[PDB]
């Protein structure tokens with residue numbers, strides 16, 4: 001089942017990109033709706049059975065970004081309703097993790113943080129007129145997701161579940177954090193998308209698949225996150241200081257609101273994609289959070 005999925009994708013790549021010969025192909029990653037392949041120890045091929053926005057973003061950034069940090073440069077694309085494939089040369093490096101960060105010297109850490117702040121400053125500073133179609137309004141997306149809840153499963157939720165959702169919506173309505181600067185954000189800027197070179201400096205960034213014109217605060221939500229997957233609040237805070245001209249408390253409020261939203265986001269994903277286990281997981285997560293002392 002490892003060896004069979006790969007054969008079909010080898011076939012599709014050779015069918016759709018005429019002169020492309022697959023000598024080797026293995027799985028390097030996968031979401032719940034996509035799979036990524038390392039081909040010829042040289043190319044990444046991201047694939048999905050339903051990437052046009054993602055392509056437009058790479059094409060916009062490879063034109064306009066001034067940076068030594070490498071990003072996917074799309075050489076192969078096939079995009080249709082039922083299948084999408086993007087291919088580009090693998091960016092070489094090692095992914096940032098907590099464990100690697102804790103072994104870096106104070107100075108090594110500082111340089112990495114400066115590299116990050118610098119990349120974000122450059123991306124957030126772009127004139128985004130040429131990708132203006134790629135706007136994203138998170139508040140309005142939540143209101144629309146909430147309506148879909150009300151139209152589907154909300155009435156069958158428990159009272160505890162409903163209180164969690166209502167209490168979130170009360171907070172969404174009171175917050176000011178969606179009313180600030182908009183700019184082009186990576187919008188999934190977690191350390192599993194950041195690549196280091198042999199000196200532990202930022203050498204590449206991947207997965208601009210959720211990128212768009214959105215609140216400036218968006219690109220700090222994972223840098224600020226306190227979890228096993230991410231480095232820590234202090235990492236995000238120092239990066240925020242280095243980046244400058246940004247209200248740190250509101251960045252944290254933004255991050256905290258999105259974190260509160262995660263279980264509802266999980267439920268909504270379950271409804272939209274008809275996957276009951278996601279509905280169950282998000283509801284379960286509500287109980288876990290409700291009972292943490």
Ligand SMILES: Nc1nc2c(ncn2[C@@H]2O[C@H](COP(=O)(O)OP(=O)(O)NP(=O)(O)O)[C@@H](O)[C@H]2O)c(=O)[nH]1
Pocket residue numbers: 028029030031034036044046089090091092093192206207208209210
């Ligand atoms: N070293 C390296 N790995 C890459 C590169 N591009 C993708 N990957 C690997 O492929 C995995 C999946 O890639 P990614 O762009 O994050 O897509 P995804 O997040 O699973 N899919 P989607 O963005 O559609 O949800 C990554 O976790 C990483 O391991 C690359 O340029 N270099």
Ligand SMILES: NC[C@H]1O[C@H](O[C@H]2[C@H](O[C@@H]3O[C@H](CO)[C@@H](O)[C@H]3O)[C@@H](O)[C@H](N)C[C@@H]2N)[C@H](N)[C@@H](O)[C@@H]1O
Pocket residue numbers: 188189190222225227229230259262269
């Ligand atoms: N894996 C548990 C964590 O999930 C979320 O964080 C991840 C976050 O959320 C993913 O959402 C998936 C479900 O749709 C999930 O599979 C996620 O990977 C992801 O977008 C980042 N690139 C990596 C983040 N660390 C939460 N915001 C975080 O609080 C929680 O600790």
Ligand SMILES: [Cl-]
Pocket residue numbers: 276279280283
């Ligand atoms: Cl359920």
Ligand SMILES: [Mg+2]
Pocket residue numbers: 193207
């Ligand atoms: Mg990814």
Ligand SMILES: [Mg+2]
Pocket residue numbers: 188207208209210
């Ligand atoms: Mg992605």
